[PDB]
Amino acid sequence: QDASPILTSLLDTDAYKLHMQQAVFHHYRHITVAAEFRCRSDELLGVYADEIRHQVTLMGQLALTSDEFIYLSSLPFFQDDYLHWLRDFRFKPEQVSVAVHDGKLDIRIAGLWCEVIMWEVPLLAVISEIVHRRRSTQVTTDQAVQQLRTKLEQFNALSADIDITHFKLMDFGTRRRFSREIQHTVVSTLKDEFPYLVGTSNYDLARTLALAPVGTQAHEWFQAHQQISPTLANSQRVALQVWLDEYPNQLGIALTDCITMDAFLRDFDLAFANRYQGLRHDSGDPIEWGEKAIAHYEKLGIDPMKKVLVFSDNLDLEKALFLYRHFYQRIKLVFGIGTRLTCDIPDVKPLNIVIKLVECNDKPVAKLSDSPGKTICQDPAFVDQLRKAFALP
């Protein structure tokens, strides 16, 4: 139905959103933030504004169900104070401003971080579904399934000569999925047909398909700490410590490129390297990055085979297999694939859209990374300050 909701579950979002939301609820309940939409491509999405606005209002109706509560209570991640608060949580549509200027979609979101944090993934998934169902009216679940099966055949062919049994794939594709139904179809097909699927970031699919919910933290956790910790140069160490404080023995993958990998390794001391299970790559050459990670573990006396590298920088299954060949004899590996799984249909172009943190406590925050052109920060002075504090060139 035209005006009917695209989203019907509060769990149709990525696990890292709830994992971070709980940390923010426990530690930073009164901190405010602002976040903004960007369309990375040369695309104009202004025409979709009214429909996006309508869906944003609809999201005000989403509410945790009792079955969902019981499911979350079964997992090792959640405390009951948070779960009781989550049961009362409702999106507040007023937090989201949708405007159009020169045909460009402008979306800004502002309010308490523990509330605002929940918008990013479902709002992106709603924008994605709105745009695709308008532009690509002929797409069937069958087309999506057949493309997936062709790729799984190519994967099997290219891996026949190696021990592929340590290959691990995560679905990370909620945000820019072609639609909710396409994601459901491809993830269910993977569970039934691909031994190496280890889980999905989507909490609703983790529950309903009986898969492990995966995902730890995201850049906003590190970025927000740039306006939380008194010392800017320590903001990433504080973010790593507060995460362990919240999750001492679960969710132990640290994202490495809010600043740069080199800066990260300067912060990643023996205690962090022992308590965390592993590291996630999101920018720069993955070969160089993985080698840096392995060498760091060796320098600290840690057996790299007892740690994990997570790769998820807009991967496809072929690139993931190539990375596996390079690293699998030396360290444990997980590969998160996003749009290449949930929006890979003949004659359909994926959208390159994001919603990223721009302020915390009314002050700028930024992600640098090891890839140029990934900075949304519109405060060049702050970016300069951040570079200085982290001793970057």
Residues that bind Cl ion (CB under 5 A): 39, 45, 104-105, 184, 316-317, 340
**How far is Cα 233 from Cα 176, in angstroms, rounded to an integer?**
33
Which of Cl ion, Mg ion, none has residue 279 at its interface (CB below 5 to 8 Å by kind)?
Answer: none
**Nearest distance in Å: CB 225, Mg ion:** 15
**How far is Cα 124 from Cα 338, in angstroms, rounded to an integer?**
13
Which of Mg ion, Cl ion, none has residue 104 at its interface (CB below 5 to 8 Å by kind)?
Answer: Cl ion
Which of Mg ion, Cl ion, none has residue 269 at its interface (CB below 5 to 8 Å by kind)?
Answer: Mg ion
**How far is Cα 341 from Cα 147, in angstroms, rounded to an integer?**
10
Which of Cl ion, Mg ion, none has residue 317 at its interface (CB below 5 to 8 Å by kind)?
Answer: Cl ion
Chain positions contacting Mg ion, by CB under 5 A: 269, 271
Kindly tell me which of 304 and 338 has the beta carbon lying closer to Cl ion.
Answer: 338
Please identify the residue of the shown chain whose CB is closest to the bound Mg ion.
Answer: 269
**Nearest distance in Å: CB 245, Mg ion:** 13
Kindly tell me which of 274 and 361 has the beta carbon lying closer to Mg ion.
Answer: 274
Kindly tell me which of 273 and 331 has the beta carbon lying closer to Mg ion.
Answer: 273
**Nearest distance in Å: CB 271, Mg ion:** 5
Which of Mg ion, Cl ion, none has residue 280 at its interface (CB below 5 to 8 Å by kind)?
Answer: none
Kindly tell me which of 281 and 340 has the beta carbon lying closer to Cl ion.
Answer: 340
**Nearest distance in Å: CB 196, Cl ion:** 13
φ, ψ for residue 391, nearest 5 deg: 60, 35
Which of Cl ion, Mg ion, none has residue 53 at its interface (CB below 5 to 8 Å by kind)?
Answer: none
Kindly tell me which of 198 and 383 has the beta carbon lying closer to Cl ion.
Answer: 198
**Nearest distance in Å: CB 236, Mg ion:** 12
**Nearest distance in Å: CB 360, Mg ion:** 23
**Nearest distance in Å: CB 103, Cl ion:** 7
**How far is Cα 240 from Cα 252, in angstroms, rounded to an integer?**
10
Kindly tell me which of 270 and 287 has the beta carbon lying closer to Mg ion.
Answer: 270
Which of Cl ion, Mg ion, none has residue 39 at its interface (CB below 5 to 8 Å by kind)?
Answer: Cl ion
Cβ(371)–Cβ(284) under 8 Å?
yes
Kindly tell me which of 301 and 393 has the beta carbon lying closer to Mg ion.
Answer: 301
List Cα–Cα distances, 28 to 20, 24, 108, 302, 363, in angstroms. 11, 5, 21, 33, 16
Kindly tell me which of 52 and 251 has the beta carbon lying closer to Cl ion.
Answer: 52
**Nearest distance in Å: CB 138, Cl ion:** 21
Which of Mg ion, Cl ion, none has residue 340 at its interface (CB below 5 to 8 Å by kind)?
Answer: Cl ion
